[PDB]
Amino acid sequence: GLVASNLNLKPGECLKVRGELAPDAKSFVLNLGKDSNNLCLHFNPRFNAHGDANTIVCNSKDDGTWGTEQRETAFPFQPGSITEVCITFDQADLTIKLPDGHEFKFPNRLNMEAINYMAADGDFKIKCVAFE
Ligand SMILES: OC[C@H]1O[C@@H](O[C@H]2[C@H](O)[C@@H](O)[C@H](O)O[C@@H]2CO)[C@H](O)[C@@H](O)[C@H]1O
Numbered sequence: 854g855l856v857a858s859n860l861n862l863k864p865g866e867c868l869k870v871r872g873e874l875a876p877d878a879k880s881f882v883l884n885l886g887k888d889s890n891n892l893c894l895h896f897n898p899r900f901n902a903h904g905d906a907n908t909i910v911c912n913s914k915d916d917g918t919w920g921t922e923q924r925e926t927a928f929p930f931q932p933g934s935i936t937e938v939c940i941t942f943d944q945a946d947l948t949i950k951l952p953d954g955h956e957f958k959f960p961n962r963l964n965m966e967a968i969n970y971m972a973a974d975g976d977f978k979i980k981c982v983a984f985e
């Protein structure tokens with residue numbers, strides 16, 4: 854999966870990620886934080902994996918150890934198609950904005966004020982990445 858560092862997202866900025874889901878997508882990932890072991894956001898929508906179907910699982914990682922899981926019922930994704938996710942942030946929390954219109958929030962537990970790391974994983978092939 855594609856890894857990008859140094860991208861310094863400051864509060865208020867919007868990171869748009871666009872890509873295509875594999876035809877038999879089981880799940881894909883999007884990690885944001887300071888480094889691979891310090892993620893303020895772990896965006897793991899699961900079509901079918903770990904005992905979960907059509908459910909988005911969010912979390913944070915501190916020095917390698919996971920935090921409390923927060924699950925979202927909304928799931929506007931389909932295998933073998935192209936989608937995008939818009940993510941914004943501030944001291945409060947991050948705001949994930951799904952392609953189907955609605956968005957939900959996830960608390961900025963690690964309390965960081967600058968995303969610098971990003972990593973995609975799973976059955977998701979990135980085609981575009983914008984910083985608006
Ligand atoms: O929580 C983020 C992280 O979860 C891992 O899976 C969890 C699983 O959801 C939970 O039910 C179990 O008790 O512990 C697992 C931790 O190993 C995922 O493997 C990972 O991709 C993230 O999504």
